[PDB]
Amino acid sequence: SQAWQPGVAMPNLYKMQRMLLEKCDLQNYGDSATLPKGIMMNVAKYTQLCQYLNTLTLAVPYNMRVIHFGAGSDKGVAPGTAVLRQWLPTGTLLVDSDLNDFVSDADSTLIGDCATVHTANKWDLIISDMYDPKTKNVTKENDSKEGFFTYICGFIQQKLALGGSVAIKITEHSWNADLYKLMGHFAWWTAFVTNVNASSSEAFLIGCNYLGKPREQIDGYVMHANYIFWRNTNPIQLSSYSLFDMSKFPLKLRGTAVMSLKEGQINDMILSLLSKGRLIIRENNRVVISSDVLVNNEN
């Protein structure tokens, strides 16, 4: 039934629980979906992600700005960026980044640890597929992880436009409690599991329409326990069905209004529009990025 959707979103009732963190034991763990001929896993995965984002209230302004972290692959190319650029309106500014070198269709690519990346401007949508290989070395308790997740929480608070949205990849062991806490600063949030990768504890933590203040106080340790509890008790059947219907894939250019506004001016009417997908608050200046480079002379 779920199988004709692009994936499954964490049901609200699981979000309201107070579980303890257990080990994730998926009954289809590792199983592989049958992908359409010649289609890479990450093309299918990002396609289902974008098909799900199509059902939310994303702000889609003119001159939209999108940044994509973790966009490289062991293949040296960027399949998720190619799907993002297909999905996004033509002309959307798309910047991607990754630790390792890769070739990309993004308007600009920065190679380096994500903590080196800075931007003058704010963004309307942040995508992250970052995942640390060492997270595989499971030597203990599953604790909240720092690393790139600390960067991402700061980056959201500093450089995500009000009204903007995020999708940040997590897994059972690749997660962070403040990122969940930060989901309570959006008008709505979920954890979305693609149907092509239903056999993995991967999900995308999706924050929809950023408010810049807490709508809700979320205990992130508890919320990840809740997410694992859901995954543990709700086997999802692998499915690539939704990949065969691309007729309504493109994100509609809504022309969402962009206004600049000092903190003093965000009243409840503004908050109401932010939360409905109807407003972005940021400057509309030129997009400028940089990557910090550590200089060393080994001679």
Binding site: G38, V43, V77, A82, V83, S247
Partner: peptide, 9 residues
């Protein structure tokens, strides 16, 4: 190889 093929109609 690893040319990136897109899903489309």
């Amino acid at each position: 190889t690893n040319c990136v093929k897109m899903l489309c109609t």
